[PDB]
Amino acid sequence: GSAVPFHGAHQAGIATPVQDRLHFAAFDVTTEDRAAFVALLKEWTAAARRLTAGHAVGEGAYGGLPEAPPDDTGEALGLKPSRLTLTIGFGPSLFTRFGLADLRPEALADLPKFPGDNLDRARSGGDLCVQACADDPQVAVHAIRNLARIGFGKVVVRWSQLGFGKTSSTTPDKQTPRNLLGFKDGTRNIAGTEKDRLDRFVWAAEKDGTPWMTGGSYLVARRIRMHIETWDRASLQEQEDVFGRDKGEGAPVGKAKERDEPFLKAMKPDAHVRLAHPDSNGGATLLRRGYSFTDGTDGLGRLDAGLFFLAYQRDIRTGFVPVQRNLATDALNEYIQHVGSAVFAVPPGVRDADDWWGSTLF
Amino acid sequence: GSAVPFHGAHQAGIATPVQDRLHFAAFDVTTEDRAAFVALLKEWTAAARRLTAGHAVGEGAYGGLPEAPPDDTGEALGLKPSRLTLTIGFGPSLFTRFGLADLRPEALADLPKFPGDNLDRARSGGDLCVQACADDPQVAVHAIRNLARIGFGKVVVRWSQLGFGKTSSTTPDKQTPRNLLGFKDGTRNIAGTEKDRLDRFVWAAEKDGTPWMTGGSYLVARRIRMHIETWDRASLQEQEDVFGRDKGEGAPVGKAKERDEPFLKAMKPDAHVRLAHPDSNGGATLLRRGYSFTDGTDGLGRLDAGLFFLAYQRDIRTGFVPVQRNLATDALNEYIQHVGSAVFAVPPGVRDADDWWGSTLFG
Numbered sequence: 001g002s003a004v005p006f007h008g009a010h011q012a013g014i015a016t017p018v019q020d021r022l023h024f025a026a027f028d029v030t031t032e033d034r035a036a037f038v039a040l041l042k043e044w045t046a047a048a049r050r051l052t053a054g055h056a057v058g059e060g061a062y063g064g065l066p067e068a069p070p071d072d073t074g075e076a077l078g079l080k081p082s083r084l085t086l087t088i089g090f091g092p093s094l095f096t097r098f099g100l101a102d103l104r105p106e107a108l109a110d111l112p113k114f115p116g117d118n119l120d121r122a123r124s125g126g127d128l129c130v131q132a133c134a135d136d137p138q139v140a141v142h143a144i145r146n147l148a149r150i151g152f153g154k155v156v157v158r159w160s161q162l163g164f165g166k167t168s169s170t171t172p173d174k175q176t177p178r179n180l181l182g183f184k185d186g187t188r189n190i191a192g193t194e195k196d197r198l199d200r201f202v203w204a205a206e207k208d209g210t211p212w213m214t215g216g217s218y219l220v221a222r223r224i225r226m227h228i229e230t231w232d233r234a235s236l237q238e239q240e241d242v243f244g245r246d247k248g249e250g251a252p253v254g255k256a257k258e259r260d261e262p263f264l265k266a267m268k269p270d271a272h273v274r275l276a277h278p279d280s281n282g283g284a285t286l287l288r289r290g291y292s293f294t295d296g297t298d299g300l301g302r303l304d305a306g307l308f309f310l311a312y313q314r315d316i317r318t319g320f321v322p323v324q325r326n327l328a329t330d331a332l333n334e335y336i337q338h339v340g341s342a343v344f345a346v347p348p349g350v351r352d353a354d355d356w357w358g359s360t361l362f
Numbered sequence: 363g364s365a366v367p368f369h370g371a372h373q374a375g376i377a378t379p380v381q382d383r384l385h386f387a388a389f390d391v392t393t394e395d396r397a398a399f400v401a402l403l404k405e406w407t408a409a410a411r412r413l414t415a416g417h418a419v420g421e422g423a424y425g426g427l428p429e430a431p432p433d434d435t436g437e438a439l440g441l442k443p444s445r446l447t448l449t450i451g452f453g454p455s456l457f458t459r460f461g462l463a464d465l466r467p468e469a470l471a472d473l474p475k476f477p478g479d480n481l482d483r484a485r486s487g488g489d490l491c492v493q494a495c496a497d498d499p500q501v502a503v504h505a506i507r508n509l510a511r512i513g514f515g516k517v518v519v520r521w522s523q524l525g526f527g528k529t530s531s532t533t534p535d536k537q538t539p540r541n542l543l544g545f546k547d548g549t550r551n552i553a554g555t556e557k558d559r560l561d562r563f564v565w566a567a568e569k570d571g572t573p574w575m576t577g578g579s580y581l582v583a584r585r586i587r588m589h590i591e592t593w594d595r596a597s598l599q600e601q602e603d604v605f606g607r608d609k610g611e612g613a614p615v616g617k618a619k620e621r622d623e624p625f626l627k628a629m630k631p632d633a634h635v636r637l638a639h640p641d642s643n644g645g646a647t648l649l650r651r652g653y654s655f656t657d658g659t660d661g662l663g664r665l666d667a668g669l670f671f672l673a674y675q676r677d678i679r680t681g682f683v684p685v686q687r688n689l690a691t692d693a694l695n696e697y698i699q700h701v702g703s704a705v706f707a708v709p710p711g712v713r714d715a716d717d718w719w720g721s722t723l724f725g
């Protein structure tokens with residue numbers, strides 16, 4: 001139930017232990033007035049300081065003037081902070097506004113088309129994003145709803161995604177969660193304690209070429225549908241061969257324990273783990289932080305199921321792009337389809353109580 | 363505690379403690395063969411016994427023959443029972459199959475059209491339901507996914523709804539949950555401790571007319587969207603006047619504490635509490651067991667959120683129908699819309715290890 005500190009050199013919600021629930025929103029900007037947009041970023045930062053400490057925004061949820069709408073919508077009253085983090089990102093499309101064209105980072109690369117992509121344009125892209133993670137879904141919905149309300153007239157929600165359960169780990173000391181295919185997901189990630197690996201693979205550095213982004217990161221979001229009818233009729237051996245790990249323990253093929261190191265030559269040449277491993281990709285390493293979803297039925301008698309994949313990296317060109325390119329022959333492709341995509345530059349942290357989201361850019 | 367017993371005179375999931383999360387699924391039957399359907403009910407009961415104890419279905423999720431699909435899909439390995447309950451119900455449309463038309467209970471009444479209804483036919487009705495409630499949403503989803511798999515070829519999933527209430531790890535058990543309008547929700551309800559009130563208002567009795575249903579109950583489900591962005595622009599006074607209770611404490615107007623008994627004459631005539639109260643409805647009293655939902659955002663950027671309303675009662679004609687009829691002029695109607703509906707007869711409990719869901723109906 002405890003609070004996660006909001007201020008720092010980096011934004012929380014990346015290296016932080018992964019919380020149980022997600023509410024992710026992408027917004028488009030509707031104002032052309034730079035000063036008005038700056039005012040919004042400041043007001044949002046002030047609200048985020050309240051929300052992440054379990055307090056109501058503005059003057060509260062009740063006890064004001066009877067004839068005015070309350071400043072806070074009130075549905076998180078009496079709840080703990082529940083490890084809420086709020087992480088903001090800026091999309092490539094933002095940099096066509098407010099005279100920002102020459103400040104777009106090179107590392108904020110547009111993704112190529114990948115074989116098998118079927119991207120819905122309405123649930124792709126976005127001028128900006130807010131990732132809300134918490135252990136209580138009500139706390140996460142409250143945060144997104146109140147930010148959107150404050151932004152009325154300056155921003156609109158483009159698309160959103162809820163995640164009911166995590167499929168990732170930044171804490172190797174704790175149990176690794178399973179995805180809806182029934183396999184542990186998150187064994188070989190980057191841990192929040194691994195400061196050297198975070199500096200090498202996740203945080204942007206001054207020397208990388210974009211000063212305002214120092215201490216930030218780059219985010220790729222992919223909405224992935226899972227063909228569960230097809231998967232659920234596969235044999236146990238087929239399932240294990242797809243990944244290169246056994247289902248019950250999650251050990252590499254031939255080994256006894258989850259955290260034993262993979263021996264790649266024992267895996268099939270199209271096994272997911274073999275293709276995705278840093279040693280297969282010139283050392284490229286990612287911080288994975290995704291969640292499972294189910295959005296009803298598919299209208300054909302079946303449950304809908306998928307994975308909302310999130311990865312953080314120091315440079316999109318040296319992280320997600322080489323790895324996903326190497327997955328062109330993945331055995332897993334038979335059972336999944338990418339149906340949504342977005343990239344964002346995640347700025348540095350809010351240093352103290354006088355700072356504000358995006359201050360290094362604006 | 364960690365598990366809820368499966369066996370009993372009544373099914374669990376009605377009077378037993380309210381769990382943090384819901385996965386509710388409605389199913390349509392595709393077979394015409396009565397024997398095949400009975401065999402499914404037996405297989406589903408065997409699976410439910412395993413699932414509610416935190417065990418995998420059948421021979422397990424791994425360690426069987428490599429060339430066979432696993433019996434259990436594996437996504438709940440390592441999780442706890444999580445207070446899982448599985449509650450089955452039968453829709454009016456099931457009774458047009460298997461020669462059952464003369465065994466439909468009179469208390470399983472079709473609902474009338476109510477003012478302002480905008481029902482999506484695709485998210486309404488169903489031959490069967492399974493209500494899966496647990497404190498961990500992955501435990502609930504795993505249960506529905508595996509029942510649907512076991513049934514493939516005999517049933518399909520018609521519609522599915524996820525919901526949430528409180529998070530019990532961080533929120534005290536005695537605190538009333540708030541709904542997404544920011545008001546406390548559940549103050550004046552039937553509690554599972556009230557044995558006599560359950561007998562009077564919730565459980566079907568033998569003398570009610572349908573012997574196979576003795577110890578069962580009747581369920582109404584309504585998916586109710588809230589117009590969140592319109593509500594959030596209303597004044598504090600307007601929101602309180604809609605309900606007849608204050609927002610901070612949830613006390614009735616003119617009183618000081620949440621649990622103070624209401625004085626109906628102090629509320630506005632079309633306030634929700636005044637219209638819904640038993641004294642306004644000839645004594646009609648309901649067990650509410652609903653869950654909030656937030657599904658995402660719609661094509662206009664608005665939040666697709668609301669209340670998945672569930673009510674249990676001894677007879678639909680003397681429970682939900684009179685009360686919802688009385689809400690025709692409710693001040694709350696400005697901010698909500700009913701967009702899905704279904705009714706089910708929930709049979710009696712599974713008595714012991716040799717009994718099965720539906721045994722009193724099928725024989």
Ligand code: HEM
Binds near residue numbers: 185188277307
């Ligand atoms: C529905 C889609 C996916 C599923 C079900 C899935 C599943 C898994 C599983 C079960 C593991 C093994 C345990 C672990 O180390 O985490 C794994 C590893 C991994 N996955 Fe995926 N994955 C999916 C999509 C992706 C995508 C899109 C990428 C990147 C483009 C990716 C990158 C990785 C990486 C880098 C590893 C760790 C390899 C290593 O260093 O040992 N995965 N995945």
Ligand code: HEM
Binds near residue numbers: 605607624635685686
């Ligand atoms: C989105 C829809 C609804 C919302 C937000 C809502 C909200 C509330 C609230 C805040 C209360 C007061 C606290 C309490 O005693 O629980 C209440 C009471 C009540 N509601 Fe509703 N309600 C909704 C729909 C319905 C429907 C559809 C019915 C029945 C057909 C219903 C029946 C009642 C009853 C019987 C009470 C208790 C009144 C009493 O005995 O004091 N509600 N509701």
